[PDB]
Amino acid sequence: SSKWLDGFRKWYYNAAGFNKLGLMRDDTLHETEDVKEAIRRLPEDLYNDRMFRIKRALDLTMRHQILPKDQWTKYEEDKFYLEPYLKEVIRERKEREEWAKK
Amino acid sequence: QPQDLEFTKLPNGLVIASLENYAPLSRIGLFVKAGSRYEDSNNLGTSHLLRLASSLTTKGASSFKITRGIEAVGGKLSVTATRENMAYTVEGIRSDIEILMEFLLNVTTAPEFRRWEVAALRSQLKIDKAVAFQNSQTRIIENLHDVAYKNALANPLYCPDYRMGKITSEELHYFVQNHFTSARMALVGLGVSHSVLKQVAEQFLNMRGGLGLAGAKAKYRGGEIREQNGDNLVHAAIVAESAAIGNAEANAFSVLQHLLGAGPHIKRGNNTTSLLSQSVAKGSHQPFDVSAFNASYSDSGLFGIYTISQAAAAGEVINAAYNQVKAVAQGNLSSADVQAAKNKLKAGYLMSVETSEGFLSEIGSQALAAGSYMPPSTVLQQIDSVADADVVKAAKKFVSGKKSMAASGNLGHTPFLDEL
Amino acid sequence: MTNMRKTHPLFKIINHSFIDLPAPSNISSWWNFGSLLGVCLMVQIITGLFLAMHY
Amino acid sequence: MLSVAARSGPFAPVLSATSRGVAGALRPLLQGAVPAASEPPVLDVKRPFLCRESLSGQAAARPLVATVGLNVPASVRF
Amino acid sequence: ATFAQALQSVPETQVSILDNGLRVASEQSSHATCTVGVWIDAGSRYETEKNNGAGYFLEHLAFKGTKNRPGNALEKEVESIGAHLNAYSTREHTAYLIKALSKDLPKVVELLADIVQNSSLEDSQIEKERDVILREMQENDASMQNVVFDYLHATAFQGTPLAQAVEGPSENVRRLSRTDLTDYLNRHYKAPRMVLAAAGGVEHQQLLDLAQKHLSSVSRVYEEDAVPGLTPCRFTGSEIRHRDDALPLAHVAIAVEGPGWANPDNVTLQVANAIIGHYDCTYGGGVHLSSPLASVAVANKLCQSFQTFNISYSDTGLLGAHFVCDAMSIDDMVFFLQGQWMRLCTSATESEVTRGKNILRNALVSHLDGTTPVCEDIGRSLLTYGRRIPLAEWESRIQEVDAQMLRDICSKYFYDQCPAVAGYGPIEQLPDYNRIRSGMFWLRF
Numbered sequence A: 001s002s003k004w005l006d007g008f009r010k011w012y013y014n015a016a017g018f019n020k021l022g023l024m025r026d027d028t029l030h031e032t033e034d035v036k037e038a039i040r041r042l043p044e045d046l047y048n049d050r051m052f053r054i055k056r057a058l059d060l061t062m063r064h065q066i067l068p069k070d071q072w073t074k075y076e077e078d079k080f081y082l083e084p085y086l087k088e089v090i091r092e093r094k095e096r097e098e099w100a101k102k
Numbered sequence B: 001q002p003q004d005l006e007f008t009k010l011p012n013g014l015v016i017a018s019l020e021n022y023a024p025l026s027r028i029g030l031f032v033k034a035g036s037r038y039e040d041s042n043n044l045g046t047s048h049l050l051r052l053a054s055s056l057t058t059k060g061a062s063s064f065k066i067t068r069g070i071e072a073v074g075g076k077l078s079v080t081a082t083r084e085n086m087a088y089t090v091e092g093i094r095s096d097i098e099i100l101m102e103f104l105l106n107v108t109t110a111p112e113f114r115r116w117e118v119a120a121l122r123s124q125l126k127i128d129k130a131v132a133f134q135n136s137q138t139r140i141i142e143n144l145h146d147v148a149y150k151n152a153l154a155n156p157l158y159c160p161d162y163r164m165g166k167i168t169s170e171e172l173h174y175f176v177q178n179h180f181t182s183a184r185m186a187l188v189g190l191g192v193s194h195s196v197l198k199q200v201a202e203q204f205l206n207m208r209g210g211l212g213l214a215g216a217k218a219k220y221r222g223g224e225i226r227e228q229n230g231d232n233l234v235h236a237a238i239v240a241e242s243a244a245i246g247n248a249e250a251n252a253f254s255v256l257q258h259l260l261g262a263g264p265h266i267k268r269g270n271n272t273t274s275l276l277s278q279s280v281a282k283g284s285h286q287p288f289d290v291s292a293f294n295a296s297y298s299d300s301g302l303f304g305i306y307t308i309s310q311a312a313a314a315g316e317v318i319n320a321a322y323n324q325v326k327a328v329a330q331g332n333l334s335s336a337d338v339q340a341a342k343n344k345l346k347a348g349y350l351m352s353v354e355t356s357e358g359f360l361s362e363i364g365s366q367a368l369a370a371g372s373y374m375p376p377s378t379v380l381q382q383i384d385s386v387a388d389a390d391v392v393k394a395a396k397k398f399v400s401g402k403k404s405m406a407a408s409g410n411l412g413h414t415p416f417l418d419e420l
Numbered sequence C: 001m002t003n004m005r006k007t008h009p010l011f012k013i014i015n016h017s018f019i020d021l022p023a024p025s026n027i028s029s030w031w032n033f034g035s036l037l038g039v040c041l042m043v044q045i046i047t048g049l050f051l052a053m054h055y
Numbered sequence D: 001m002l003s004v005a006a007r008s009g010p011f012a013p014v015l016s017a018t019s020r021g022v023a024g025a026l027r028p029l030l031q032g033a034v035p036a037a038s039e040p041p042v043l044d045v046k047r048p049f050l051c052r053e054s055l056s057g058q059a060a061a062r063p064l065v066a067t068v069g070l071n072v073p074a075s076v077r078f
Numbered sequence E: 001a002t003f004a005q006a007l008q009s010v011p012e013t014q015v016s017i018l019d020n021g022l023r024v025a026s027e028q029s030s031h032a033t034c035t036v037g038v039w040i041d042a043g044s045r046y047e048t049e050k051n052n053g054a055g056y057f058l059e060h061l062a063f064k065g066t067k068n069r070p071g072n073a074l075e076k077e078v079e080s081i082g083a084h085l086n087a088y089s090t091r092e093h094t095a096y097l098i099k100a101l102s103k104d105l106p107k108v109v110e111l112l113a114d115i116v117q118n119s120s121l122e123d124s125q126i127e128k129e130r131d132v133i134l135r136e137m138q139e140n141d142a143s144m145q146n147v148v149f150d151y152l153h154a155t156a157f158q159g160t161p162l163a164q165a166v167e168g169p170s171e172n173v174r175r176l177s178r179t180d181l182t183d184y185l186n187r188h189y190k191a192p193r194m195v196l197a198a199a200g201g202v203e204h205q206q207l208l209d210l211a212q213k214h215l216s217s218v219s220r221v222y223e224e225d226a227v228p229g230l231t232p233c234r235f236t237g238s239e240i241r242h243r244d245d246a247l248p249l250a251h252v253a254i255a256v257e258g259p260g261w262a263n264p265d266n267v268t269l270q271v272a273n274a275i276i277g278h279y280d281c282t283y284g285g286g287v288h289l290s291s292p293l294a295s296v297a298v299a300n301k302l303c304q305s306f307q308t309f310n311i312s313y314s315d316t317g318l319l320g321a322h323f324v325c326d327a328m329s330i331d332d333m334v335f336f337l338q339g340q341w342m343r344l345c346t347s348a349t350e351s352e353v354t355r356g357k358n359i360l361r362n363a364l365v366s367h368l369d370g371t372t373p374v375c376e377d378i379g380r381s382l383l384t385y386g387r388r389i390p391l392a393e394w395e396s397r398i399q400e401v402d403a404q405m406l407r408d409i410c411s412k413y414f415y416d417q418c419p420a421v422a423g424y425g426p427i428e429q430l431p432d433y434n435r436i437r438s439g440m441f442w443l444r445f
């Protein structure tokens, strides 16, 4: 039942509500030390786009509004830009931890 | 037990030299013909950052893994760079030399060159330049090479201040892919057998063409530069063209350099056998030092006078040294002093190769310059074949040649090139 | 690692006040007295609390 | 035509520097501002050479060679 | 080809004693160049504050002419053969060494023999290197590391002959004369305090024949019939601080008392220093250095540099650290350094012990690369230990060091001790002696 899981994933993505604020999935991650290091390694255009998206979301939440439905972040164009940087940061931190174990 | 020096050239031009002396600690260096002379004006200072970028993440080992593995076993890693070529040397125990070879070859062959790493490394670039420019000899030599050549040797070792914060990792990848090619590198090993060197050479090194970019022949320029920076001592270097490496006049220029004086032999001596120091101290009474500066490259060369004098006594010291060299050029010299200069040059060459690191550096330099190993006795007998007329001819070529001057200090009394 | 005395947001006040406070070397015993006042103040409070428990 | 600064036409304020101690009523063109630039690092002072014996050996005689170690301090030879 | 038989394949140092008591030692190698030196057990510790600059002024005068080669003539025959002549003097040793070719061995033995025996001194030369040493001391005042280490030796060995420097104060070099130098030569230049060391392409038989021909007469009789001894020096927990706020950087050295030359525990202490290591601002490593002190110093941008040291003297020594940094970091750096010391007294695990053992192995073997450090090791080893310790013995002594005895030795020498602190520069945030003294013990341990 792959398409049932996929359509349920689309439903959960629409029901989470951050697509109505223009946000991506990687903007909603909590900025811990690994996530902050992932933002620090970003290229500057992606960093500026992310900062504008957070500012727009905070401005929309201030007025208790949402974007119009055509401006919502669609599921197919939601790019997981922070995944390789976060993956590298987790790999390096686990390597440091396993070196500190021995 | 060191039965010979195993010297081999692979068909792609990569040179492997190995000597098995059964030393307690092995030393393995990769010598790449990728010095500071291979940059044009669009990527100046890239060799400085590529020298400092040895501890970055590579395809096969992270920077944390590289550092903790290179110093967990007690080993060491260094990069030695001149204008012509660079050397990546690893050194450690015979038991742990295999992982050191893997770390060295991961550093040299496949660097990743991430953007945040070089962004964090530009600060260390500025700090290293400011530390290395604490000696005024460094600034004088940099300015002397800047004035002496139009291109392809006037590029500095250290990154210029405008280039800091503007060197990208794409230029580093461009430099690596254009200058770290197969027929410009020699892998030299001491305390390690030849077969593992050949296995590492066929494993880690055989994905490069061999030629890359050639160069721009290092045309001569001439002229002078004067830096009023207010120092207690005035440093002046007056240089002219000389022989390149491999000519019959380079050995004569070295013999002339040791005849005029190229360093002290006694701690707190007076340099009685140095002609330049005796000629200057004949009329002077203040602290000073005069030596003969010599440098030989693949296509060009530099020979001249280096003087450290007082602010108000620079002209007398410079004129005394120049008159001494002009007297040497007119045949006014003793053959016994030429014999003493030959003995000094032979002693200095033999003392430069007694240590393992100097031996490795000389083997790598010879393998890059000529592609074959030269035993030291052949070098000594090549020194012995220098005639006195060759020394007179070298001095005459220095006197009659066009000059490049680099001066620094209080230059109110320092003379000019046309006033000599 | 770090220095917990100088970087903790609560311990920074005690470090600035009673641990690494720069003080004159030549102050006499009279400079004790105000500190004694503070001690006497809390002593009063403590005794007063127990005198508030039966009065 | 004397007054060298006025004799040179376009290079009038390049050959002469004009400042003021008391500001005028007329506001100057191109007020200008120094941007916050970087600072050189602080290094410890080096040994001076005020005697002839300490200057012995300080003169350069070889091509300049830099060396950067990992846990070795960076050195240079003349 | 393992490490054990590689260290066993090092040639044995050949040691013989002449009839006057002179030691003669050689290290035969395959090199075409040799290093021959004379080591005399005579330094600033052997001076009675009336000849406090005798060794420095004598080694200034040593290469200025002899009774057989007056003037610069000997200089000619050391500069016409390409030989390099060097000399130095520490607080308890003196060395005169020539590096040359193998063919010029009898001549360099002859020059080393008559330099230390028939050195000609004349009053014009006395005043010439008097003003030269005055200018040398004025130059050496600007090197802050030398000033700090002289301060540390002055405050850690108060009232003893180990406090006085090699150069001595300026009043002595303005008041030393010919007679005191002759007395110093007659008292200190004797055969039972003299080692002739050779390294490189030197056979022991030829060196012994030349030493018997030239160094047979050294006047080893006690002429004054007074025994020169070596009393123990009293370590003093103290501090000296030289406040001068115009200097750009501050140098601080903190050290405790060392065990001595002949203590085996020094080897363990070397491993301890290899755990702490060193750092300079031009290091290419960065955050991922193995030493926690260097890693926290580069993470917090604390220090310009630090380095550990174990200086050793007869029964005594200085075991500590030296760092240069800006003022605003000083106390923080001290705290971290103290923590590292206490970590080695309490929580030394086997991983950093193995790392320090490997670092000590590599440094102690690769230091002896060349004829000059081998000759220096031979001379200093015959003067200090009474014998040349083989390198396999050093390997066997390093191998027995584990974490338990390392923290035992560290608790013996670092824990709850009274250190000596020397500071120079903007050292206002460098604390009192009481905070540093309180930093030598943990309340949690």
Ligand code: HEM
Residues within 6 Å of the ligand: C041, C044, C045, C046, C047, C048, C049, C051, C052, C055
């Ligand atoms: C908040 C803290 C305090 C409490 C709860 C407190 C409470 C009391 C109580 C219940 C009494 C009556 C008990 C008795 O005297 O038989 C008392 C008496 C008294 N308190 Fe306090 N008190 C406090 C602080 C102080 C302070 C700071 C002072 C001044 C130094 C002070 C001065 C006095 C005096 C003089 C008496 C009269 C003692 C006497 O009977 O002779 N109290 N207090």
